[PDB]
Amino acid sequence: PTIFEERHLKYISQLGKGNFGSVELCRYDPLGDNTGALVAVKQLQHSGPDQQRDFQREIQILKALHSDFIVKYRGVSYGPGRQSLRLVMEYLPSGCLRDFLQRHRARLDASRLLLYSSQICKGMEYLGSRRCVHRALAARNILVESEAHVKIADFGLAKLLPLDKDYYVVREPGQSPIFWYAPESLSDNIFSRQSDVWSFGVVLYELFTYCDKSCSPSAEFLRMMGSERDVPALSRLLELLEEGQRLPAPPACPAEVHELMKLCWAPSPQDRPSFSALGPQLDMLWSGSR
Ligand SMILES: C[C@@H]1CCCC[C@@H]1n1c(-c2ccc(/C=C(/C#N)C(=O)N(C)C)o2)nc2cnc3[nH]ccc3c21
Numbered sequence: 473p474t475i476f477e478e479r480h481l482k483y484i485s486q487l488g489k490g491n492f493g494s495v496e497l498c499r500y501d502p503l504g505d506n507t508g509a510l511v512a513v514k515q516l517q518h519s520g521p522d523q524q525r526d527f528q529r530e531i532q533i534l535k536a537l538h539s540d541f542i543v544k545y546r547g548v549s550y551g552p553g554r555q556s557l558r559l560v561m562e563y564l565p566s567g568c569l570r571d572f573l574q575r576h577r578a579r580l581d582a583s584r585l586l587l588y589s590s591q592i593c594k595g596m597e598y599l600g601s602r603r604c605v606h607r608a609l610a611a612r613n614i615l616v617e618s619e620a621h622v623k624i625a626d627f628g629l630a631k632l633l634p635l636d637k638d639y640y641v642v643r644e645p646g647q648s649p650i651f652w653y654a655p656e657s658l659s660d661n662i663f664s665r666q667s668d669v670w671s672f673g674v675v676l677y678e679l680f681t682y683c684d685k686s687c688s689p690s691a692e693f694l695r696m697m698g699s700e701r702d703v704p705a706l707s708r709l710l711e712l713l714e715e716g717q718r719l720p721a722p723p724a725c726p727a728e729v730h731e732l733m734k735l736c737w738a739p740s741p742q743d744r745p746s747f748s749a750l751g752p753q754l755d756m757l758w759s760g761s762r
């Protein structure tokens with residue numbers, strides 16, 4: 473059931489492009505009559521050994537996860553030849569949360585944003601119990617299953633912590649979404665479940681601004697970086713964060729949610745709340761808003 477025959481996967485279109493991979497909308501059509509199920513299928517391009525190995529990892533992690541708040545693994549496929557591997561996932565046609573929020577802002581109220589917040593937190597709690605660091609977490613990689621149900625996706629950078637270590641360190645990445653990363657990740661290449669909490673804070677910011685491009689993290693940075701313009705962004709961001717500067721409270725954001733953001737952005741990773749501590753608070757806020 474989890475082995476899709478490659479010759480029966482029919483390409484329709486591209487859903488996402490990464491540095492080394494893409495996610496493609498396909499039909500699995502073993503009857504050949506175009507009646508099969510639609511699936512989302514990841515494969516690599518421009519991939520060396522490291523990228524192949526990371527993709528094997530991604531598959532094993534996602535296959536093991538069973539949460540209502542994590543995109544469903546379906547199976548794998550292999551073509552003929554070297555570098556044949558494909559990851560088959562459920563397809564969610566409503567697309568990503570980032571696009572969904574911008575399209576439907578005028579009808580998605582604070583209660584609904586609280587619901588999405590709580591669901592994403594529950595998915596991160598699930599990951600944490602499996603010692604998985606997601607790293608990529610952002611509104612652009614969270615999927616909308618229905619208007620009242622979201623799921624975490626893009627496990628391309630996900631990694632399991634060793635049983636006896638609560639962080640990992642990588643070599644300097646070439647291309648990072650710098651405005652989502654914890655300072656220890658930006659400066660020392662350290663990632664953990666605590667750096668995931670920082671990113672979740674930025675997700676809460678994305679939710680409560682409806683991903684408006686006028687107040688995106690990059691826009692706020694360009695406003696707050698100061699009058700000196702030709703300064704490298706990463707350098708300057710690290711200085712602003714060290715000085716204690718943070719993204720502003722969105723006008724429509726409940727004060728209690730802004731306070732949770734601030735705690736997610738504590739300087740010291742050990743001072744940030746766990747997802748297990750955040751969950752109850754978001755659950756109480758959501759349930760009080762129904
Ligand atoms: C979000 C996930 C994970 C990242 C790659 C795209 C992917 N993805 C998407 C999808 C298409 C576009 C976007 C989001 C973007 C934003 N912002 C974007 O890429 N832009 C604007 C260029 O996300 N739709 C998917 C339906 N089913 C899927 N199943 C597994 C995965 C999956 C689907």
Ligand SMILES: NC(=O)Nc1ccccc1
Pocket residue numbers: 651674689690692693696712717718719737
């Ligand atoms: N976490 C946080 O506040 N990050 C940030 C701060 C200033 C500009 C852009 C991003």
